[model samples]
Target: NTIIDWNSCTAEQQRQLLMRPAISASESITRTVNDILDNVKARGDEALREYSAKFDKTTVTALKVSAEEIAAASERLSDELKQAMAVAVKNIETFHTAQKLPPVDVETQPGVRCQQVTRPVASVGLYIPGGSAPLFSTVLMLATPASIAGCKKVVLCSPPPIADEILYAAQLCGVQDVFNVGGAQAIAALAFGTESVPKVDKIFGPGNAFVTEAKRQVSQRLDGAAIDMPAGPSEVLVIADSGATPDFVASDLLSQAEHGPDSQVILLTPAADMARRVAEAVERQLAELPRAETARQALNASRLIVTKDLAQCVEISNQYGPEHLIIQTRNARELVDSITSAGSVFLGDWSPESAGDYASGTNHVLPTYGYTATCSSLGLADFQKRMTVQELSKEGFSALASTIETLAAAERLTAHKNAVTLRVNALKEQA
Candidate 1:
């Protein structure tokens, strides 16, 4: 049901086949999100509580959670989950700490000082899904980087009944505030400060359709906050050769497909026999998977593409710009240079997408839905801003005075030329 021979399709059909199912600006969702944003902005904390009751179905009396509350949740979690989270956090911190850029100080010319400095955003808001999928690992991915970047006021927002694991993780990452809010209302509360929840410079994390749309709306507004990236369904593209193991490849495909019914998975290979084997193996594994219904729905849109060669497989992958790219070929390492677009890459059959999702040093918050072509994986850089500073001594100013005056004069701005000439004349007279 999922196989596609490369030569069998027309150009238009091929393009349609490779395309992700469309998502966006559907009138109803946008309207719903916009309504939530507006009401939250107008009503503040009152609106948040109302939305909580309406959407979350759990009434939260206090919007901001207390230290005692967080500690109690930490106590509720098992020692094993705590240990696992700690290990993941340590790796996350290690990798993000290593990402810190050394101060860039240079004297481009004698006495002309120039530097690039790193500054954290000061405040940030992290969102976590608290419903069917708790996604407590996202806490480690988001808050760990923000803390590493030294964001002074780190806050988090999740729906009612935020899992004990989420609370424990938040405290582990040193998030300063926790708000019991969710959906578009939570995004609005974070973007525009309520009496309880503080407005932040940027918002981070993944969520359902409403939350995604809310993030988009808030990002566009002048008064609202910046977002991590435009997020859609999870996806993975695996490119394999005849030497690649079918079972391993099929398992990898199912790993992503199980993430959601909309999650997309594709396989590209040169051997028709390998394609046949992977298809059968995927069937065998799918039947045994607990999330088989969700995965099977995803596979309905999935494809097993038989390409002319390994080079064509790379070509197709680059065009799609998948969220995750796996190379299971004999020369997998060597083929990485040809890949220009995926958000994350896994080499060989041994490295599973699951590793990156949890314990691996790499951040799992990656750009999806073709955003891999433009956006980047979440990292320390996202939480920090880079700004350049320059200084000019008298001699350095004198040396460049004529050049500045000439450029400003050419641009026909009197104030610009006067700003330079006035200083140059004063310097000449003082000298």
Candidate 2:
């Protein structure tokens, strides 16, 4: 049943072979983040500072990132990098700005109309990841959309960088009031609000399990601020066909494994021989990866399951509801019909998950940990609410008045019926 070995497979087969699971979750992760949140809420900026120094190894002299710091950071970037950022900004702006839905008005009758109006959430908090890389691309993704949505206030939180170059990426994006915080404490500061950090209407961006749990707990405690999505370890499921390439599969699996030691990768194949080749290729490729040790640790907990065919593989993938999915088959697009849940999908042999993760103009802040079946990735429309408005002329009200009275009476609320009768009578008297 040898389907395709790395040495013997085509480029297409290799590409679908790499998606791995990124989320790591359990009660332990929950309790740990909650404890950190409790401390942060109890101590305010003091707790935030302590956690910053502890986890990120940086001292926080002030909670807010200053104006001068932002200007300086903007100047620090090379002209080439700045130019590239501008292009990313333009493309992202174009994509997100297009998401604004126009208000709609519908006339129920000649004198009555109902409509929906949109308004930006008053304030929002965005967390830029600094634990691994300085994700300047994140600033472009979140801030551009918030601006397009006309959010009045935008707050940011990122850990202070070890190197000076990494310190001000968010500042360059005009994100001030950034706290020198990371992990659960940073989430707590944004969600609960301390002396320096004002609470926000909602919190967005990705984080570790502790940070994710802190968001959930703080939102519950306040019963006010909303969260963008659930956080889970990154994961991808690769579905390969008989014609798939083993080398591409090896790379795809390793791409996710390098995210951290706890990450997971899974491969589902119809051909038993191809499965063996891919498994061997993964070992060979892992040896040369820069993050091989981390990948190895993650691979230990990962899996490779062989199925009767592609149909069975897709069925199991739906049950997993992975954060990312890559399809590599003769008619990969056709199998999309079988996918019931996934955060994002990469189709065909030419498409790679990394492309969307970095510069595809699509968002990478996806739902994980079995959330994809319901929740969606962060979108521009998420920052606004659509409030419905209805108006009726005197004649229109008279026609509807009896219906309102009847409904109110059926509900056993005389006061509600009286309210409609009062208005109707007033209108008749004026006529």
Candidate 3:
């Protein structure tokens, strides 16, 4: 990571400094994803099997996982691990269950009752990434909320061999239809139904570029499924003060950097000596990590900038709009009101990003590539749809009839005016 003095930089240089690693799309990736989507759409299970072998290097005979497999997987996990996951599950369930909302009813007029009610989506597909490690935590994060929202069907898809932890978590969340297929093919199968994999109303979770592209392409079509949000590579930004410890701050940076080669991490601090100390600490910690090479690659695009002051650091952070934002200043909580864009915020030195990643009860599926400017972090509300209901008494219709007719006539909508006029005149004649 390179260091820059934010105060000395020109306006154009400041803009360039805030830039993230670009997510470029090439024809090759697009063509490859389109081919996968097309094959899955036509051949269904046959194509899923072929692609499973081609990409994952594993032959999947049975696309769907069996109950026996789930049971055996659960049996294989150690008691300690199972107990930990149980705690995480309980915490996630508690937080998400609290998000459940009741219907709202109001009287907009004397006799008109208007209300908004929430209903779970009929079905949802969750894609859990299986590489590097078992992201059983993602299962708890997604499946808990979906269950709390009362979804009728919650299907999970991951590449084989699906980890026992994943199956255990899925079973815990009440997700019955677990499939062993992944990548763009899995996304396609979820979008367009196959003989085996069920179609879903919306798709959730994070993935590599191909999977992200698949969601983007499929969601755009008129007949396609809706996606949770458009995503890019993972990212994090830190605003530190003199009070922050270098070791703690360095670990936070490396944690996100190890996510992938394409991921980026940034540090904005006012103390030049603190910047130097954190850089040294980062080097020391990075050497001990098993995924050091991955983090090293990510650091090629990362930044450590010395801003003029804490205020400047905050300004720069808002412009970046990172997936995760960590504030390690003395008064971190006081800065919360100034933040405008970020998927999630971790305040104070003790609140590491990992807490939110697992057992902290906050959803980790977040928007990346600056989409946090307009998109939101995954939450319980994402699993439900809002619908409005309205009722009008006869007197209510009479009360608003003249206003409706006048507006309709102003807009030259004769049918709209006639509809209200006919109803009102009929009521008058009846009286």
Candidate 4:
């Protein structure tokens, strides 16, 4: 099994062990994505159709999904899947709805009031990735908050032959305009308005490397729309002790591994015996998976680290800043306060990373690639913009006139001081 003894490693060795799979900014990927963006900008719907046929391996006559198609897809979804989606919707709505921030009003001084008001972005684009599995849960994760934040127009885009379940979930979230477009082309369509898809204020979702690169490229441009955050392959770091069940720990590691060959999974344990057993359990359970080969490729880069103590495990975890952190120690919840960085934390053996990915009432779209150190998990605030307003009464202006003029005079800006002096003199003259 893949293993590392932290006690035996040098300081540099530990750093190397903690390093993630390298991501190079190759010119080919950037140039290709830029070309796609340019094509979409120049040709509009025609470019989207060509890319749909080239990359998604599907021909599409209509780029935008119609209301009748949504209804048909809803009908096509199984009763069990629809029921599950409804439950997820309710929980997501409840969680985001409660995060509604009230306007903050503050009186910095007498007769001077400052307030911050929240406004939903006029339009938003949601990109639901379509691959081996339909990410219907992502629909609830993104659209629920956008709906709760009261965004004016919520447009969605996924690959063609869109899953009925995805359409069903989008319908549940009240997202009506979903396009049959995927890859960097989809991002371009959202960033620069295609003839079919509308240009949006911000784009939200996760996708393959190409899609992510597209988001990055577009966000850098002056006319491009804002992106939620940079993304990378999925990852999970599990801090387990002897009290942690080996099977459960193994399951959590493999769940992240199965996401892709580039996905990373790490196990940090103080108990050497527990680490061994977890490694064994991972192999045993991995044999039963249909995606065993994919997980095996990921497991090749994964690590089973035996730390000197539990505190060492915490130290390593904070530095790595994993996308998902699972603590299965005796006092799992107690570790939360010490965790400085992570996209999301799952405490105890019973709380799997999948819960947050699905219906745990928290956002699954989170920072990756060590970006958790600075970026935040997607939330209702991502869908809204805050603007500050300040109102000053005559008394307020009079009260602060001397201070303002003094600062302006110090800066040698006669006009700045003169404007306030004129107002103050007018008031004094009237009195």
Quote the lDDT for 371 in model 3: 91
Candidate 2 lDDT over residue span 224-341, tens digit each: 3688876666787888878999888777888888877766677888877777888889889988877578888877766666667777778778877888888888898998888998
Candidate 3, residues 347-398: lDDT per residue as tens digits? 9988999998988888988988889988988998899999999999998888
Q: Candidate 1 lDDT, tens digit per residue, 286-319?
A: 9998758989899898899999999999999999
For 1-431, candidate 4 gives per-residue lDDT tens digits of 56789989898989998887677778999999999999998999998888767765457889988899989988877899888888888888888888988769998999889999999988999998886688789999999999988899999999888888888888899996999898899999999998889999899998877888999988998878999988777789999988999999999999999878998899999988998999999999999998589899999988999998889999999999999999999998888999999999999978998888898798988888788889888999999999999999999888888999999999999999999989998998999
Q: Give the TM-score of candidate 3.
A: 0.97
Q: What number of backbone clashes does candidate 2 have, counting pairs of residues 3 or more apart or in separate chains?
A: 26
**Residue 418 of model 2: what lDDT?**
95
Worst 10 residues of 2 by lDDT: 1-10
Please give me the total number of clashing residue pairs in predicted model 4: 0
Clashing residue pairs, backbone N/CA/C < 3 A, model 3: none
Worst 10 residues of 4 by lDDT: 50-59
lDDT of each: 0.91, 0.75, 0.89, 0.90
RMSD of each: 1.5, 5.5, 1.5, 1.5
Query: Per-candidate TM vs. native?
Result: 0.96, 0.84, 0.97, 0.96
Candidate 4 backbone collisions, by pair: none
Question: Which residue ranges in model 4 land beyond 4 Å of their true spot?
Answer: 53-58
